[PDB]
Design a protein around this ligand. Structure first.
Ligand SMILES: CCCCCCCCCCCCCCCCCC(=O)OC[C@H](CO[C@@H]1O[C@H](CO[C@H]2O[C@H](CO)[C@H](O)[C@H](O)[C@H]2O)[C@H](O)[C@H](O)[C@H]1O)OC(=O)CCCCCCCCCCCCCCCCC
Ligand code: CLA
Ligand code: CLA
Ligand code: CLA
Ligand code: CLA
Ligand code: CLA
Ligand code: CLA
Ligand SMILES: CCCCCCCCCCCCCCCCCC(=O)OC[C@H](CO[C@@H]1O[C@H](CO)[C@H](O)[C@H](O)[C@H]1O)OC(=O)CCCCCCCCCCCCCCCCC
Ligand SMILES: CC(=O)O[C@H]1CC(C)(C)C(=C=C/C(C)=C/C=C/C(C)=C/C=C/C=C(C)/C=C/C=C(\C)C(=O)C[C@@]23O[C@]2(C)C[C@@H](O)CC3(C)C)[C@](C)(O)C1
Ligand SMILES: CC1=C(C#C/C(C)=C/C=C/C(C)=C/C=C/C=C(C)/C=C/C=C(C)\C=C\[C@@]23O[C@]2(C)C[C@@H](O)CC3(C)C)C(C)(C)C[C@H](O)C1
Ligand code: OEX
Ligand SMILES: [Fe+2]
Lengths: 33, 125, 34, 56, 37, 334, 147, 30, 61, 51
C-alpha cells in the first residue's frame, strides 16, 4: 500500500478544510468579518 | 603592438576588447640565430596592414591594370596566428615548410565602386 | 569617426537634459485645475 | 552668532578629521593624496591595455 | 529526503508549498461570505 | 518671466497642433531618426550577413527586392549583443556590411515608442481626462520590445531579432515555430484569444451601436450626418441594442452597463497581448511550449502518433533548414 | 468485453502508473520521489579509487613546481591557468582523502596558501606568488605525509 | 526600373498621410 | 522522541491556525479568552525550544 | 572601444567637455527660473502650486 498517497491526499483535505472553516465558523458566530 | 614579453604580462580580461589580439608582436635588435637541424618556427603571427585588389583603372587617356588600396569589411578577423612548420636547410638556404596553425582568414574587402571582394588570406601548404 | 561620436553625444545629453528639467520644472502644476 | 557657531561646528568636526588623518597615515605609510588619488585610478592589473585598433 | 526523524511527515511537507496560493483563494471566499460588499 | 518660462509653457502648450511635451523631447528626435534611417535603409542599404558566415543578404529595394521580400536585416551574428554604433565601425562601408542600421532603427524605435507612451499620458494629464490610455498602448510596446530586444537578449544576439520587412517577419515566425513551438504555448493561445475575441467584440460593439441608431437623416444622405460633433443627446438607443443582444444569447449575461462594457473592450485585447508578449519573452529564455511528442504509447510500447507529432514534424522541417550552414554541431543551442 | 487496466494508484500497475514504490517491489528506494536504492550495494567507496586520488596529489606537486618558472618569465595568466587546469581535481581529492581533524587542518592551511597565490597572481606581485607557493608546497608535502 | 514604382508608391502614401494630418477638415462644435 | 513531539506540535498548531483568527475577528472573544491563548502560545514556543534541543542533542549524540 | 567597459561610455576628455557643458547649459536655463527662490513647503497631496 502506498501510504504516501494515502497520507498526501488527506493532508490536502485537512489543509483545504481548515482555513475554509474559518470562513464557516466566523459566519455561524456571526461577528465582524 | 609591443613585444611578446609584455603582451604575456597582460591577463586575458584586460586584453579583451582592446584590439590587441590581432597585433603581431615586435622585435627590438639586430642579431643572427643560425637554426639547427631539428628546430622550427612556432608562433608565426602574420598581419596584413594594407590590402590591394587588381582592377581596370582610369587615368590620363589610357586604361590598364593596377591595385587600389581597399578597405576591410570584416572587423578584426583577418590575421593569422600560431602557425608552425619544421625548418630545414639543404643547399645552404633555409626553408620553412608550413604545416599547422590558423592558416586562413576569411576576409572580405570592398572595392572603390561598391564591389565586395571576399577571399581567404591563407598560408596553407 | 570620433567627430560623429561627439555630435551624437552632444544631441543625446541635450534632449535628455530637457526631459530631466521638464519634470523638475513643477510638472505636477502643469494642470487644468489650478 | 552665526560665526561662533560655524567656528564651533568645524572645531568639533576637524578633531575627528585629524584623528582620521592620523590613523590613515599609520594604517598606510602614505599621505592622503596617495590614498584618495590611489582609489581613483583603475589599478594597473585591472585596467585594460589600450586602443590598438587601426584606422583602416 | 528529510532527516530520519522528520521522514514520517513527508506528505505533510508535500502540501506545504501550495498553501500560499490557497490564502489568495480565501480572499475571494471571504468576499462571497460578506457577499461582495 | 524667464526664458525658461516662455519655453516650458510652449513645450506643454496644449494649443499646439501636435503636442510636444517633455516626452516629445525624447520622442520626436528619436522617432525621426528611426523613420529616416528606415527610409534610407529600406531603399539603399548594402547587403548584410545575418549569420556571420560572410554570406550577405540583400534587403534594400535598389538591389532587386520587392516591397514584400525587401527588409532591413538584423545585425551580424558575429556582433552578437555588442552595441555597434556608427563610430565603432572603421567605416560606414563596414557599418552597413555588418548590420549596423538594424541597431540604429531598433534602439530608436524602442526609445521613441516608450516616449510615445509617456506622451499619451502627459497630455491626458494636461487635458484633465482620466489617464490610462497609454496602459492600453503598453500591449504593443510589450510586444515590440519582446521581439526586438528581449528575444535578442535571451538568445544572445541581435541577429535573432525580427527583421524589418514583410517577408522578413515571416522568416522570424517560422524559425520561432521550429525551435520554440509557439503554437503549443498557452501564453500564445491566450493572446490569439485576445485577437480573435478582440476583433470579435469590435465587430459586435460596432454592429450593436450602428443597428440601434436614432432617426435624423434622410434616405439620400449618409447616416453619419445624424451625429453632429459635440452633441448632448445620445446618438443611438442603448435599450434597443441591449434588448436585441439580450435575446441573442441570454438575459442575465450580456449585461446592461455601457460604461462597464467599454472596460471589457479595453481589457480583452490588451490583457491578451500582454500575455503573448510574455509568451515570446519567456521563450526568449528558452522555456518552450508543450512537447507532447511520443506521449501516447500502447500496451506493447510503440509510439502511437497524435496531431502533436505531425506538428513537431513541421518543426523538424523548419529546424533542419533555418540558417543551414551557420550550424556546425548537432544541437541548436545558440 | 474489456475491463481495461484501471490502475487507480492503489490498484494494479504495469507500465504507466506512478505509484512511487509499488513496481519497485521491496528494493526500497532512497526516498519515494526517486527510483534508485539508497547506498548499500555494488559500490564499496573504500575500494581502489585511491589510486586516482593519490595520483592527483602526485601530479599536484609537479604543477606547483611550474609556478616560479612562470613568474620570472612574467606570465601571469599561466600562473592563474595552471592553478586551475590540472589543479581542479585537488579539492575533490584532498577533501575526499582527509579523514581526521588533523588532516582537515592541514588541508585548511594548504587551501589558504593556495588561494593567496591566485590572489597575488591577480594582483601581479611576483614576490608574493613565490612566497605563497613555498607556503603551499610545504603544506602539500606535510599533508601527503600525514596518511 | 520597378524600384521607381516602389519608391513612388511608398513616398506616395507618405505624402497622402502628410495632407491627412495637417490639411484635414477640422471638426467644429457649432 | 522527536517524531512524537512534532506530531503534537502539528496538532496544537491546527487549533492555533483555526481558533485564533476566529477569536481575533470576534469583537468580544479576545479580551476574555486572551489568557487561554497566552497559555497555548507560551506552550507552543516552549515546544519549539524543546524540539530544537532534541535535534541538537540527537544529531551530535 | 566596443566593450572596452567604460564609465557612461566614453574614451576621451573631449566628451567630458560635452557631457558636463550640455547638462550645465540646459541646466543654467533651468536655474534662471528657479534661482534665488527656496523654502515654502506646502503639506498637501502634490500641490507644489507655487509660481
Ligand atoms: C570621478 C572620478 C572618476 C574617475 C574617472 C573614471 C575613469 C573611467 C575609466 C575608463 C576611462 C579610461 O580608462 O580612460 C579613457 C579616457 C582617457 O582619455 C584619454 O584622453 C586623451 C586626451 O584627449 C585629447 O584629445 C582631444 C581630441 O578630441 C582634445 O582635443 C584634447 O587634445 C585632449 O582632450 C586622449 O584622447 C587619449 O587617447 C585617451 O586615453 O578617460 C577619460 O578621458 C575619462 C573618462 C570619463 C570618466 C568620467 C566619467 C564620469 C563623468 C562624470 C564625472 C562627474 C563625476 C563627478
Ligand atoms: C569621508 C570619510 C572617510 C572616507 C572616505 C574614509 C576612507 C577610508 N578609511 Mg577612514 N576615517 C574617517 C573617514 C573616512 N575614511 C574618519 C572620520 C575616521 C576617524 C574615526 C576614520 C578612521 C579610519 C581608520 C582608523 C582607518 C580608516 C581606513 C580607511 C580606508 C579603508 C579608506 C580609505 C583604514 C585605513 O586607512 O586602511 C587603509 C583604517 O585603518 N579610517
Ligand atoms: C531624444 C534624443 C535622443 C536619444 C535619447 C538618442 C539615443 C541614442 N542614440 Mg541618437 N540621435 C539623436 C537623438 C537621440 N538619440 C539625433 C537627433 C540624432 C541625429 C543627429 C541622433 C543620431 C544618432 C546616431 C547616428 C547614433 C545614435 C545612437 C544612439 C544610441 C546611443 C547614444 C549614446 O550612447 O548616448 C550617450 C549619452 C549619454 C551617456 C548621456 C546620458 C546619461 C543619462 C544619465 C541617461 C542614462 C541612461 C541609462 C541607460 C538610463 C541611443 C539609442 C547610436 C546608436 O544607436 O548606436 C547603435 C548611433 O550610432 N544617435
Ligand atoms: C490563425 C493564426 C494566427 C493568429 C491569429 C496569430 C495571432 C498572433 N500572433 Mg501568431 N503565429 C501563428 C498563427 C497565428 N498567430 C503561427 C502559425 C505561427 C508560427 C509561424 C505564429 C508565430 C508567431 C510569432 C513568432 C509571434 C506571433 C504573434 C502573434 C500576436 C500578434 C502580435 C501583434 O502583431 O500585435 C502586437 C503589435 C505589435 C508588435 C506592433 C507594435 C506597434 C508599435 C508599438 C508601433 C508601430 C508604429 C508603426 C511603426 C508606424 C505607425 C504607422 C504610422 C506612420 C501611420 C497575435 C496574438 C507575436 C506575439 O506573440 O506578440 C509579440 C509574435 O511574436 N505569432
Ligand atoms: C469551427 C470553427 C472554429 C472554432 C469553434 C474554433 C475555436 C477555437 N479556436 Mg480556432 N481556428 C479556426 C476555427 C475555429 N476555431 C480556423 C478556421 C482557424 C484558422 C486555420 C483557427 C485558428 C486558431 C488558432 C491559431 C488558435 C485557435 C484557438 C481557438 C480556441 C479559442 C478561440 C477564442 O478564444 O476566440 C475568442 C472567442 C470567444 C471568446 C477555440 C477552441 C486558439 C486557442 O486557444 O487554441 C485552443 C488558438 O491558438 N484557433
Ligand atoms: C533548562 C530548562 C528549561 C526549563 C525547565 C524551562 C521551562 C519553561 N519554559 Mg523555557 N527556555 C529554556 C529552558 C528551560 N525552560 C531555554 C534554554 C530557552 C531558550 C532561551 C527557553 C525559552 C522559552 C520560551 C521562549 C518560553 C519558555 C517557556 C517555558 C515554560 C513552559 C511551561 C508553561 O507554559 O508555563 C505556564 C506558566 C508558567 C516553562 C516554565 C514559556 C514561558 O515562559 O511561558 C511560561 C515560553 O514562552 N521557555
Ligand atoms: C541541548 C543542547 C543543544 C545542542 C547540543 C545543540 C546543537 C546544535 N544546534 Mg541547537 N539549539 C538549542 C540547543 C542545542 N543545540 C536550543 C536550546 C535552541 C534554541 C531553541 C537551539 C537552536 C538552534 C538553531 C536555531 C540552530 C541550531 C543548530 C545546531 C547545530 C549547530 C552545529 C553544527 O553546525 O554542526 C553540524 C550540525 C548538524 C549537522 C545538525 C544540526 C548543533 C547540532 C543550527 C543547525 O541546525 O545547523 C544546521 C541552527 O540553525 N540550534
Ligand atoms: C548620482 C547617482 C545617480 C546617477 C544618475 C544617473 C542615472 C543613470 C544611472 C544608471 C547608469 C546606467 C549606465 C548607462 C549605460 C550607458 O550609458 O551606456 C549604454 C550606451 C554605451 O555606449 C557605448 O558603450 C561602449 C562601451 O565600450 C563603447 O564605449 C561605445 O563607444 C559607447 O558608445 O550608451 C547609451 O546608450 C546611453 C543611453 C542613451 C540615452 C538613453 C536615455 C533615455 C532617457 C532617459 C532619461 C534620463 C533618465
Ligand atoms: C587677523 C587674523 O587672525 O586673520 C584671521 C581672522 C579670522 C576670523 C580668524 C579668520 C580665519 C580663519 C581661517 C583662515 C580659518 C581656516 C579654517 C580651516 C582651514 C578650517 C578647516 C576645517 C576643515 C575640516 C573641518 C575638515 C574636516 C575633514 C574631515 C572630517 C574629513 O572627513 C577628512 C579626510 O580624512 C577624512 C577623515 C578621510 C580621508 O580619506 C579624506 C578626507 C578628506 C575626507 C580670517 C578672516 O580668515 C583670518
Ligand atoms: C598636521 C601636521 C602635524 C600636526 C599636528 C598637530 C599639532 C595636530 C593636532 C591635532 C589635534 C589637536 C587633534 C585633537 C583632537 C581631539 C579629538 C580627536 C577628540 C575629541 C573627541 C571626542 C570623542 C569627545 C568626547 C566626549 O564625548 C565624549 C566621548 C564624552 C562627553 O561627555 C564629553 C566629550 C564631548 C569630550 C604633524 C604632527 C607635525 C605632522 C605633519 O607633518 C603636519
Ligand atoms: O540566428 Mn536566427 O536561428 Ca535562434 O537558433 Mn541559434 O540563432 Mn540562429 O540558429 Mn538557430
Ligand atoms: Fe460606444
Amino acid at each position: 500500500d502506498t501510504r504516501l498517497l494515502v497520507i498526501a491526499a488527506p493532508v490536502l483535505v485537512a489543509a483545504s478544510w481548515a482555513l475554509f472553516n474559518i470562513g464557516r465558523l466566523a459566519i455561524q458566530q456571526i461577528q465582524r468579518l | 603592438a609591443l613585444t611578446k614579453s609584455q603582451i604575456n604580462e597582460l591577463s586575458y580580461l584586460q586584453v579583451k576588447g582592446t584590439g590587441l589580439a590581432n597585433r603581431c608582436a615586435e622585435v627590438v635588435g639586430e642579431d643572427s640565430i643560425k637554426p639547427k637541424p631539428g628546430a622550427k618556427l612556432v608562433d608565426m603571427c602574420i598581419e596584413p596592414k594594407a590590402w590591394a585588389v587588381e582592377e581596370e583603372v582610369g587615368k590620363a587617356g589610357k586604361t590598364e591594370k593596377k591595385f587600389v588600396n581597399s578597405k576591410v569589411m570584416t572587423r578584426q578577423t583577418y590575421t593569422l596566428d600560431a602557425i608552425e612548420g619544421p625548418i630545414t636547410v639543404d643547399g645552404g638556404k633555409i626553408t620553412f615548410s608550413e604545416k599547422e596553425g590558423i592558416d586562413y582568414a576569411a576576409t572580405t574587402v570592398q572595392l572603390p565602386g561598391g564591389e565586395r571582394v571576399p577571399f581567404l588570406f591563407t598560408v596553407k601548404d | 569617426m570620433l567627430t560623429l561620436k561627439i555630435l551624437v553625444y552632444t544631441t543625446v545629453i541635450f534632449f535628455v537634459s530637457l526631459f530631466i528639467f521638464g519634470f523638475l520644472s513643477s510638472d505636477p502644476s502643469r494642470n487644468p485645475n489650478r | 552668532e552665526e560665526k561662533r557657531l560655524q567656528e564651533l561646528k568645524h572645531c568639533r568636526l576637524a578633531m575627528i578629521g585629524v584623528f582620521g588623518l592620523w590613523a590613515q597615515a599609520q594604517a598606510s605609510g602614505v599621505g592622503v593624496t596617495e590614498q584618495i588619488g590611489a582609489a581613483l585610478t583603475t589599478p594597473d592589473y585591472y585596467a585594460k591595455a589600450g586602443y590598438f585598433l587601426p584606422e583602416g | 529526503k528529510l532527516p530520519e526523524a522528520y521522514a514520517f511527515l513527508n506528505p505533510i511537507v508535500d502540501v506545504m508549498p501550495v498553501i500560499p496560493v490557497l490564502f489568495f483563494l480565501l480572499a475571494f471566499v471571504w468576499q462571497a461570505a460578506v457577499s461582495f460588499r | 518671466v524667464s526664458l525658461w518660462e516662455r519655453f516650458c509653457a510652449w513645450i506643454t502648450s496644449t494649443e499646439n497642433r501636435l503636442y510636444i511635451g517633455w516626452f516629445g523631447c525624447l520622442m520626436f528626435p528619436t522617432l525621426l531618426t528611426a523613420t529616416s534611417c528606415f527610409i534610407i535603409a529600406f531603399i539603399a542599404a548594402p547587403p548584410v550577413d545575418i549569420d556571420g558566415i560572410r554570406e550577405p543578404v540583400s534587403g534594400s529595394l535598389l538591389y532587386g527586392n520587392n516591397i514584400i521580400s525587401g527588409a532591413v536585416v538584423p545585425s551580424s551574428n558575429a556582433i552578437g549583443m555588442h552595441f555597434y554604433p556608427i563610430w565603432e565601425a572603421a567605416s560606414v562601408d563596414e557599418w552597413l556590411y555588418n548590420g549596423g542600421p538594424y541597431q540604429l532603427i531598433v534602439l530608436h524605435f524602442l526609445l521613441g515608442v516608450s516616449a510615445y507612451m509617456g506622451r499619451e499620458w502627459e497630455l491626458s494629464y494636461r487635458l484633465g481626462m482620466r489617464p490610462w490610455i497609454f496602459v492600453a498602448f503598453s500591449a504593443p510596446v510589450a510586444a515590440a520590445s519582446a521581439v526586438f530586444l528581449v528575444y535578442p537578449i535571451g538568445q544572445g544576439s541581435f541577429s535573432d531579432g525580427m527583421p524589418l520587412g514583410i517577408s522578413g517577419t515571416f522568416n522570424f515566425m517560422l524559425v520561432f515555430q521550429a525551435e520554440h513551438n509557439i503554437l503549443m504555448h498557452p501564453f500564445h493561445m491566450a493572446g490569439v484569444a485576445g485577437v480573435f475575441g478582440g476583433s470579435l467584440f469590435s465587430a459586435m460593439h460596432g454592429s450593436l451601436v450602428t443597428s440601434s441608431l436614432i432617426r435624423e437623416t434622410t434616405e439620400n444622405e449618409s447616416t453619419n450626418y445624424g451625429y453632429k460633433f459635440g452633441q448632448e443627446e445620445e446618438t443611438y438607443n442603448i435599450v434597443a441594442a441591449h434588448g436585441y443582444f439580450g435575446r441573442l444569447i441570454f438575459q442575465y449575461a450580456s449585461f446592461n452597463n455601457s460604461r462597464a462594457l467599454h472596460f471589457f473592450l479595453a481589457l480583452w485585447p490588451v490583457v491578451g497581448i500582454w500575455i503573448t508578449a510574455m509568451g515570446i519573452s519567456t521563450m526568449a529564455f528558452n522555456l518552450n511550449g508543450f512537447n507532447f511528442n511520443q506521449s501516447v504509447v500502447d500496451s506493447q510500447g510503440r509510439v502511437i502518433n497524435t496531431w502533436a507529432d505531425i506538428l513537431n514534424r513541421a518543426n523538424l522541417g523548419i529546424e533542419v533548414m533555418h540558417e543551414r550552414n551557420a550550424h556546425n554541431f548537432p544541437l541548436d543551442l545558440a | 468485453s474489456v475491463f481495461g487496466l484501471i490502475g487507480d494508484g492503489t490498484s494494479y500497475s504495469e507500465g504507466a502508473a506512478y505509484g512511487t514504490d509499488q513496481a519497485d517491489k521491496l528494493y526500497s528506494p532512497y526516498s519515494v520521489y526517486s527510483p534508485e536504492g539508497e547506498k548499500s550495494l555494488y559500490k564499496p567507496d573504500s575500494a581502489e579509487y585511491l589510486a586516482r586520488k593519490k595520483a592527483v596529489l602526485a601530479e599536484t606537486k609537479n604543477r606547483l613546481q611550474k609556478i616560479p618558472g612562470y613568474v620570472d618569465k612574467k606570465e601571469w595568466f599561466n600562473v592563474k591557468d595552471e592553478l586551475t587546469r590540472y589543479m581542479y581535481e585537488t579539492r575533490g581529492a584532498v577533501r575526499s582523502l582527509s579523514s581526521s581533524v588533523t588532516q582537515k587542518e592541514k588541508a585548511e592551511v594548504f587551501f589558504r596558501a593556495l588561494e593567496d597565490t591566485y590572489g597575488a597572481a591577480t594582483l601581479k606581485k611576483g614576490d608574493a606568488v613565490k612566497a605563497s607557493n613555498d607556503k603551499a608546497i610545504a603544506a602539500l608535502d606535510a599533508f601527503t605525509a600525514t596518511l | 526600373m520597378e524600384a521607381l514604382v516602389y519608391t513612388f508608391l511608398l513616398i506616395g502614401t507618405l505624402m497622402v498621410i502628410f495632407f491627412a494630418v495637417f490639411f484635414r477638415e477640422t471638426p467644429r462644435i457649432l | 522522541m522527536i517524531t512524537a513531539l512534532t506530531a503534537l506540535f502539528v496538532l496544537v498548531s491546527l487549533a492555533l491556525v483555526v481558533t485564533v483568527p476566529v477569536a481575533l475577528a470576534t469583537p468580544g472573544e479576545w479580551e476574555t479568552s486572551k489568557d487561554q491563548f497566552n497559555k497555548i502560545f507560551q506552550l507552543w514556543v516552549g515546544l519549539v525550544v524543546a524540539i530544537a534541543t532534541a535535534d541538537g542533542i540527537s544529531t551530535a549524540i | 572601444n566596443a566593450r572596452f567597459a567604460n564609465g557612461k561610455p566614453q574614451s576621451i576628455e573631449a566628451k567630458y567637455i560635452m557631457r558636463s557643458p550640455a547638462e550645465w547649459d540646459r541646466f543654467m536655463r533651468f536655474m534662471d527660473r528657479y534661482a534665488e527662490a527656496n523654502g515654502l513647503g506646502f503639506s498637501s497631496x502634490x500641490x507644489x502650486x507655487x509660481x
